[PDB]
Amino acid sequence: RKRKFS
Amino acid sequence: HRKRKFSDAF
Amino acid sequence: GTVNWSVEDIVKGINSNNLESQLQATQAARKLLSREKQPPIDNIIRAGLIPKFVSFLGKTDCSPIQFESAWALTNIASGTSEQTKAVVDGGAIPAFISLLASPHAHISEQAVWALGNIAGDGSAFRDLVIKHGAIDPLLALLAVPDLSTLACGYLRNLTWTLSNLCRNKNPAPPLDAVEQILPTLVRLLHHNDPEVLADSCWAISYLTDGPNERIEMVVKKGVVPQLVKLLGATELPIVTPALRAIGNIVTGTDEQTQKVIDAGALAVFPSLLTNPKTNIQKEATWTMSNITAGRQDQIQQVVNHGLVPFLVGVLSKADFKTQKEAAWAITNYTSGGTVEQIVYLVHCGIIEPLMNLLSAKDTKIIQVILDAISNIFQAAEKLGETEKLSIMIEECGGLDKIEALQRHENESVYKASLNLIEKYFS
């Protein structure tokens, strides 16, 4: 999984 | 009968 | 100020020989890369900005440009594999590892986040992050007397990044890396935050998915009772990976399967086998199938816990995927069970739902069910009660289904169905 920092 | 690993079941 | 800048203006600011102009332009790039709808990641890569951001990571003298460039790069690394590769090709891995020891908590967290995204891409990048030495400074951030003193988001990011270092196969993570991470993982598994618990469980589910030697490394750490406790949690994001880890452990040796039973896992299965989430019922039935594939004393524990009526339930009505797993659970039970255990299965009403599933357009489930029928008849043969079973199969319309399967396209189905008709229905 990858996650953006919004 | 025999074990099935996650990738061998689905 | 730094809101809605063009890529051209960002490039002009970053190419200036002025640190403050570079900082303002990097923050503008971070804000562009942070927008909800279509961030221009490819445009930023094409402008040659990744090597500039990576050099800004080394500017110890300017902590805001380290943070802005780390955040901009985290957003690029969170994208596609090609976008994560562009971050890695820019030399970002050693630069982020150096930032883990930053005295600024928000910078250190950004580096943790970026490395989790890089490691999360797949096996090669995970192993490359490990070779650059990320594990020691990541674990040092969690080397505190009580995890409760750490900031909530910071702990969640560290857990998630560690779970990515445990993830992926072909190859599985290096054995020494797994041994190094496991004591911290066991500690995170006893933390009270639901997100930390979910990701710790996912990490454990990855480490237990593979050869029995891999399961052993985990089970030896005494985590099975804690996993069974989490198997009973109210939060679905916790139950899902805790069930996956338990399901993975019972694919192991009879001894590893026994640790799951000894920890009281079977007492949770009446609720798991009737859970409103179809994936929970499916994976709980798969778990049951691997326990019925065990020793006769393990099949007896399934019986004692009143789980055979729950298996009759899922075989009678459930999503088809769960029903197929239920068919496997029955064939495994009938293969390893005693005559008394197989007789008990018929008395619980397994025959009618087992026969109704012979109408399914799936060759694999037909083979599995026909094998179970053969095993039940073999038990009935030992008691001389084959006629009593034959009439039971005839009455629920099972005979009509087996007879029709004699003209099936599959060879194994055709042979097994002709065998039952000739042996018990002629």
The closest of C362, C363, C305, C302 to C332, measured between CA atoms, is C302
Chain A residues with beta carbon closer than 8 angstroms to that of C34: 4-6
Give the span between the Cα atoms of C67 and C276, in whole angstroms: 44
Structure tokens at C206: 């990855």
The closest of C181, C74, C158, C164 to C128, measured between CA atoms, is C164
Q: How many CB atoms lie within 10 A of CB C292?
A: 26
Q: Do A2 and C117 touch (CB under 8 A)?
A: yes
C336 in Cβ contact with C296 (< 8 Å): yes
Structure tokens at C335: 């293969």
Task: Give chain C's domain count.
Answer: 1
C258 in Cβ contact with C219 (< 8 Å): no
**Omega within 30 of 0 (cis) for the link into C145:** no
Q: With both helix axes pointing from N to C terminus, report the angle between C411-424 and C386-395 in degrees, rounded to the nearest 10.
A: 120
Give the span between the Cα atoms of C117 and C57, in whole angstroms: 17
Q: Do C332 and B9 touch (CB under 8 A)?
A: no
Give the span between the Cα atoms of C285 and C272, in whole angstroms: 9
Radius of gyration (C-alpha) of chain C in whole angstroms:
28
- Distances in Å between the Cα of C28 and the Cα atoms of C14, C65, C79 are 10, 11, 19
Contacts of C249 (CB under 8 A, 6+ apart): C208, C215, C218, C219, C224, C227, C256, C257, C259, C260
* Angstroms from A5 CA to nearest CA on chain C: 6
Q: Is C276 exposed, middle or buried (0-12, 13-18, 19+ CB in 10 A)?
A: exposed
Per DSSP, the three-state class of C276 is coil
Chain C residues with beta carbon closer than 8 angstroms to that of A3: 78, 113, 116-117, 160
Q: Do C75 and A4 touch (CB under 8 A)?
A: yes
Q: How many CB atoms lie within 10 A of CB C94?
A: 14
C408 in Cβ contact with C366 (< 8 Å): yes
Give the span between the Cα atoms of C26 and C301, in whole angstroms: 62
Structure tokens at C398: 């099972």
- Supply the DSSP symbol for C425: -
Give the span between the Cα atoms of C263 and C269, in whole angstroms: 13
Q: How many CB atoms lie within 10 A of CB C193?
A: 17
Across the interface, of C75, C84, C120, the residue whose CB is closest to A5 is C75
- Name the residue range of residue C367's domain: 1-426
Give the span between the Cα atoms of C262 and C81, in whole angstroms: 43
Q: How many CB atoms lie within 10 A of CB C387?
A: 10
Instruction: Concatenate the DSSP letters of all residues of C165-216 into one string.
Output: HH---SSPPPHHHHHHHHHHHHHHTT-S-HHHHHHHHHHHHHHTSS-HHHHH
Q: How many CB atoms lie within 10 A of CB C93?
A: 22
Ramachandran bin of C254, using left for φ above 0, alpha for ψ from -120 to 50, beta for the remaining angles: alpha
Q: Taking CA atoms, what residue in A is nearest to C34? A: A6
Give the span between the Cα atoms of C22 and C18, in whole angstroms: 6
Query: What resolution in Å is listed for this PDB structure?
Result: 2.1
**CA angle (C310 as vertex; C371, C320 as ends), nearest 5:** 60
Per DSSP, the three-state class of C417 is helix
Q: Taking CA atoms, what residue in C is nearest to A3? A: C78
- Supply the DSSP symbol for A5: -
Give the span between the Cα atoms of C238 and C231, in whole angstroms: 7
Give the span between the Cα atoms of C256 and B3, in whole angstroms: 12
Amino acid occupying residue C158 = L
The CATH number linked to C355 is: 1.25.10.10
- Distances in Å between the Cα of C271 and the Cα atoms of C282, C289, C307 are 13, 16, 11
Give the span between the Cα atoms of C27 and C17, in whole angstroms: 17
Which contacts qualify for C351-355: CB closer than 8 Å, 24 or more apart? C351/C376, C351/C389, C351/C392, C351/C393, C351/C396, C351/C398, C352/C316, C352/C396, C352/C398, C353/C312, C353/C315, C353/C316, C354/C315, C354/C327, C354/C330, C354/C398, C355/C393, C355/C396, C355/C397, C355/C398, C355/C401
B and A touch per CB criterion (3+ pairs under 8 A): no
Kindly report the three-state secondary structure assignment for every residue of C218-270: HHCCCCHHHHHHHHCCCCHHHHHHHHHHHHHHCCCCHHHHHHHHHCCHHHHHH
Chain B residues with beta carbon closer than 8 angstroms to that of C286: 4, 9-10
- Per-window interface: A 1-6 vs C, CB < 8 A: 1-6
Give the span between the Cα atoms of C281 and C287, in whole angstroms: 10
Give the span between the Cα atoms of C402 and C146, in whole angstroms: 63
Contacts of C225 (CB under 8 A, 6+ apart): C263, C264
Structure tokens at C331: 């064939």
- Distances in Å between the Cα of C184 and the Cα atoms of A3, C99, C375 are 22, 21, 47
- Could you tell me where the DSSP H helices lie in C34-134? 41-46, 50-57, 63-77, 81-89, 92-99, 105-119, 123-131
Enumerate neighbours of C (3 or more CB pairs within 8 A): A, B
Instruction: Concatenate the DSSP letters of all residues of C347-398 into one string.
Output: HTT-HHHHHHGGGSS-HHHHHHHHHHHHHHHHHHHHHT-HHHHHHHHHHTTH
